[PDB]
Structure formats: structure tokens, C-alpha cells
Amino acid sequence: SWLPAGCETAILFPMRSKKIFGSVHPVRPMRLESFSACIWVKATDVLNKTILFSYGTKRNPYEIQLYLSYQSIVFVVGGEENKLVAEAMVSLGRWTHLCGTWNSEEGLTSLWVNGELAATTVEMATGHIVPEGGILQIGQEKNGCCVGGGFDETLAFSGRLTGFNIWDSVLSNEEIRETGGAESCHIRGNIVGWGVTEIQPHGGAQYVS
Amino acid sequence: GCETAILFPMRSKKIFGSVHPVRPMRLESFSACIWVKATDVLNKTILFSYGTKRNPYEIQLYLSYQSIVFVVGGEENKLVAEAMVSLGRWTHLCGTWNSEEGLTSLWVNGELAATTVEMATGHIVPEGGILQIGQEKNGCCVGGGFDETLAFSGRLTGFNIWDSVLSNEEIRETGGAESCHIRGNIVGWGVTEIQPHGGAQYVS
Amino acid sequence: SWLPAGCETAILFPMRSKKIFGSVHPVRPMRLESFSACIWVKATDVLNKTILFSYGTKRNPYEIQLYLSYQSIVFVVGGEENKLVAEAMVSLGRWTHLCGTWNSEEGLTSLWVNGELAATTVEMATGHIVPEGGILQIGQEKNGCCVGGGFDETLAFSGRLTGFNIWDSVLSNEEIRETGGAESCHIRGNIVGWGVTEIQPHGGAQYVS
Amino acid sequence: GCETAILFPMRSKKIFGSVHPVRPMRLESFSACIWVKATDVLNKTILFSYGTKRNPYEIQLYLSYQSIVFVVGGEENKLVAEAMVSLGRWTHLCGTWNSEEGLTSLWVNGELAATTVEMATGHIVPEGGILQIGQEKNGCCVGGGFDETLAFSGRLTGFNIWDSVLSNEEIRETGGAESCHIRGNIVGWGVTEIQPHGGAQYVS
């Protein structure tokens, strides 16, 4: 069970279902004006839309998203209208490193894979800020589980995660390249870190340390 | 029968109720009645809510300091009845909606309280939502919980939802002594499944 | 089963044990400079020391207490050094009404039963302040429900409780007499009230109509 | 055996470990060693604590940004070793106490680090306390739980407590490659019961 870096803490999603997902509980509020989020992934199968991590309040279920689709990756911020698609990036069955970015001052969006720029644009959700007090999850969208499940079966994820880090400010180009190193496990953000901030798996999600 | 009434002894971040109607809830004109004996009322106190993923305020009936507010379609649509709630004693809250011209009217204790027109005219209530009692739709799972100030504090009974507008004769008949055997076409008291959670308990 | 007032929510403590107690979760902080408590009780048996409600931080387990002892009732605030005892107030098997009081400005202490003053004194815990962030419980000491931590058996309580209200200021003499009425449980305090503030029974403690 | 170990993947508000020693914990002179590989170090992160109802700080070993602090008796008594903790690497923390004259010394990696005298002389550690790992003493079901900042974040192994002050020869022998089958006379690794809670889990 090799892992990208010295990390020995990787969540495992055996098989998609309507009750499999992970939760995150940031210590500090999620009010963001410009955020950078990176995450490793070893996807097993990709459907029309597979969620890796998603943030959404009660009145807006797509405040933030980053999902795969066949051979493309999509980054959604602010709402369902905004998007950014990189083509022919992810290969099934191999580890890879994904990283986004955003800036509310000018609405500039970016997306990196394996430390090399893939797709970028400008004027995305300009003049917008993500409200605090929402709900964050990894591998699933924002849906209830108190009664009758609710998580659509096709949107779940199956594979491995690690190094899930969310900053709260724009990063540097060199730094985004560094986190993909072979011994970069000891680099963490200030909003959510790996192995520090609470992450509670549910419904079969299990650590594979 | 008139032998049961859900109890809400406290307000917290985990207390709520859930309902599981059988038939699809997508309706054009309906009517919902309920019995409320509120122990204490804040600015907002939900009795029964309804919302989808993209809409949390499809149907609501939330209390105020002294007024009952009926919301259909969304937040921006409101209807307020001023001074007909009294803590510590039973009362009959029930509202009526008609989508043909957005006609709306709120029936309290068997007497018309307020009425308006052109409220969500033509809007169709979608299905696939979650129908709760005493708590607004919010995070079901362990992700915090519902907003504390919204939860209910008291007892409830006789939750009914009809599939068609009700005549002025029908509403009065539901407020009678023996009305408890009357049940709604979509949701019926003592028939539809109810699962109190997080402290709330039945009372016989 | 008759109840003192028109209320219909009385907690039941069937039999004492090492895992029977009630918890309270005040909405607002417990930092108190002068507090007035209150409680209805129908005790079944009284041991050397039976607790009704107790508040204690991590570094001090006896910030506030009110326990029975045979025919006497004790009120402890600040620590074991402070105390106040009435002689023969309590009678087993019948409902009764108990109230406390305290003032940090001078240290005046009082205690009422059924609206008639029983014992009163001054100069205890003078110039004292109760720190916030503690743990509050009804009917048991502050030991810990945690595995490996068990409440001492003899200190538990068995009977009925209702109208548990904790104010945050000294009351009026007439008001203290009012709450003992036969239809007066519709008046409640602010720090804790009966029927609004969370009260979670544990280990067999059960609500009753 | 040293194959196993405890894991603390996150410093939440409910994560801790508990220990249940067999013999009474009332001791006059003792010695405790443990293996720590801290993922992240804060102003104060408890490794293993011990306290009674009146006394919550009978024995403790809490880390600082670069220092390790040994406490016996309460807050007023302390002992600090400055700059001998490295994140991401194994290290061997262990200390000794002698109540006859309050003689204390802290052994790190098998070499003396700091020493003092009159460290709470004559005081007798009482029994009846609660012995935890990675978290301070406090309620878990009521009042939320423990204090978040105190909780640990990393892995631990080889928790041992002895019943007599060790000699300079014994301490080094515990740091050897084959040392891991050695166990203390009060709490031994891999024999004493351990019940991780709130997300903690073993690792093999």
C-alpha cells in the first residue's frame, strides 16, 4: 500500500452508495475571499459527475465543488454557472495531485494537476464572497441522511484520499509545485490540514494508515 | 384517536420530527391544519416546514411573538396574522392555498384570519423534498445541526395535509370535538409515519 | 399522578445507582455574581448526603450545591467552607418547594422553603465570583460519566423534579412566595428554565406526564 | 509487542485514550517513559495525565513548541527541558521522581536533560484518580467534552510506569531495539487495558 509522500493516513471509500461520505469540521470560520485548495486522489471509476469535495450552505448547494468527469476535471465556485474544465488529465488507477485557486478581487480562476498548469480563466464569480456557516464534505454533495438516505448513488466516490488541505489566500506558483513532492507530507494549510483538523468518516469510510 | 400528542420538552440543536408521506407531494392547491400549544415563542419557531435541495422554503408555517406567518413558494412571499396566538392553551392553525390566481387565506380556530391574492400564482410545489415538524430543513447528519433558536418547545397533534382546497364548511368540521377521526388525503394524523428524534417523544 | 403545578413534565429517578443523573446545557454563560435558584422535589429516601443540583468546574467540584440530609437541607456556594442548614424542613413522601439566594457584593445568603424563610446568614464567599465554563448536573455530583469514572452510589437521588429554574439576580421576597402556587409553573428564569433549556436525562432517568 | 501502536489522526473535542491500571496508583517514587512522534505541537498538548476529583494535576507530561514539561503535584510545581522535541521523528521521553527529598530528573532519548530538587517533597500521590493518554481530565458526555487545544495529534507507543526510581543503567536499556518486550511494574505496554475513544484507533 504505497502512498505518494511520507503520509500514512489515507481515507478509503470501498464502493459508492447512498450513505458513504466524509465530514470536515474546520476550527475557524469558512468565510473566504480568496482560497486555494489542493488534494491528492487515486480514482477507481469516473461517472458523469463524481464529487471529491463540496461546500454548500442551506440556500446554495454548490458554493464550492471539484468533480471528475471521464477524462476531465471541473472546478465550480460561487454557483452552478461558473465552471472550469481541464481536458484529458486524469488516468484511472494511478495517484495524482489536484489543486485549485480563486481570487474574488478580479475573479481569476486557476487549476493545477501534478504541479503543471492545466486550465485557467478570468472573471469568474466576480465580486462574490463565500458565506460562513455552511457544511463541508469530501466525496459527496450537501444532502441529508437523517431519513431515507438522500445521497444520490452516482455522485459518490471510490478510491483513496490524502493531503486534503484548504488555504485561505492565493498561493505562489512555486509553492503549488512543491506540495506534489515525494516528501511533502509535512506541509499544511490554515483552514483545514491533514492529520490535524477533524475529519470523521461515515458509512464504511475507513483509515488505511 | 385523540389520545396522542407529540411532546417537545426542550429546544436544542438536535430536536426535530420527520414525516414520510406515501403519495408524491407535488401539489398545486392544498390545505394544512395543525394543533399548537406553544410553551414559549421566539422571533421564529417552525411548526412544519418543507423544502428541496435548491429551495428550503417551499412551504412553511412559523410563529412569531404574537403572529402566525404562512410562507409558500419562497422567502419573499409572506402572509401574517397579527394577534391570535396565546401561550399555554390549545389553538387551531390552518392555511389554504390556491395556485389558479395565487389566492391564499389563513384559517385560525375555524375563523378566517387573513387573506391575500396573487401569491405564487402558477408556481408548482416540487416533489423530492423533506417534510419535518417543529424544525426547519437543515443538516441532518453530524455536521453541527439545526439552528437552536428555531426549534419548537411544547406539544403538537393532529397534523393533516389535504390534496385540494377546503370549503368554509369543512374547516369548521375539523375543529369539532370528534374531528380527530378526520385525516388528510396526503398526510393523516395517527396514520402517516412519524419519527421523533433528538429528545422529542410521544405522549399517550 | 398529581403534580404540584399544572406542568406535565417531571423527571423521574427510579432508583439510585452509579450511572443515574441529569445534565443541563445553559444557552448563556454561567458566570454569576448573584444567583437565585429554585426546585420542586418529592424525595423518597434521604441518606447522609443526597444531591439535588450541583455545579463544579475542573479545579473545584463544589462551586454550588444543594443537598438534603435526613430532616435538614444544606446550601453550599464557593466551597466546603461555606454552608447553611435548616433544621427540620423536609418531610419524606410529599411535594415541597425549595429556593436559594446569594449576593457576592456583601455575601448575604438566604434559603426559603414553601415561601417561608427557614435559615439566613451573611458573610460567606465574600468578594467571590463563580467562573464560567463548568459542568452542571441535577441529582448527582461532578465525577464523570466517562468509562472508568463512576458516580458514588450513595450521593444519587430518587424522586421527582420539576420547575428547576436558576435566575441570575436576587429576587424579591413576594416573588419567591409566588412560585410556590398551585398554578404558577408558567413563570421561569433566564439562565435556566423548565421546558425550554436543554435537560438530557441519562441512565434510566425518564420524563413523565 | 512493538508491532502495534496508537494513532491520533486529529485533535478533535472528543478524542482521548483511557487506561485502567490493576494495582493501586498510590505511589511515592515512580518513573514513566513513553514514545512520542507528534504530528503537530501546540502551546500545550497532553501526552499522559493523572488526577483526582480535588486534584486534577497529580502527574502530567505536556509538550510545548520545543520543550517538554513534567508536573507533579499541581500547577505551581514544574520542570522544563528546552529544545529536545522534533516533529516527524520518534523520540523517547521519560522522567523520574523521588518523594523522600523531592529529587526529580527528566531523561530524554536515554540521556539526562534536566534535574531539580525539592520537587514536592513528602507529597503522596493519592489513588482513585483517572489515568488518561493524550488528553486532560474532564467530562466527556456533558459540557461538550475536553478542551480542543489540549488533545494530541500523532502516534504513541510503549507507555510504561514503574514503581521505583530507575538507575542510569535501566533507562538506557529501555531505549534499545529489543527493549519493547519490557514492561513496568504498574502499567505495562501491550498488557494493561487500553480503550481508545472518539476516533482514536490501534495500528498494526
Ligand SMILES: *[C@@H]1O[C@H](CO)[C@@H](O)[C@H](O)[C@H]1NC(C)=O
Ligand atoms: C452528463 O452531463 C451532461 C451535462 O451537460 C449531459 O449533457 C450528459 O448527457 C450527461 N451524460 C450522462 C448522464 O451520461
Ligand SMILES: *[C@@H]1O[C@H](CO)[C@@H](O)[C@H](O)[C@H]1NC(C)=O
Ligand atoms: C423578531 O422580530 C423582529 C421584527 O419584528 C426581527 O427583526 C428580529 O429578528 C426579532 N426581534 C428581536 C427583538 O429579536
Ligand SMILES: *[C@@H]1O[C@H](CO)[C@@H](O)[C@H](O)[C@H]1NC(C)=O
Ligand atoms: C455523614 O458521615 C458519617 C461518616 O463519614 C456518617 O456516619 C454520618 O451519618 C454523617 N456524619 C456527619 C457528621 O455528617
Ligand SMILES: *[C@@H]1O[C@H](CO)[C@@H](O)[C@H](O)[C@H]1NC(C)=O
Ligand atoms: C504559548 O505559551 C506560553 C506560556 O507557556 C505563552 O507565553 C505564549 O504566549 C503562548 N503562545 C501562543 C501562540 O499561544
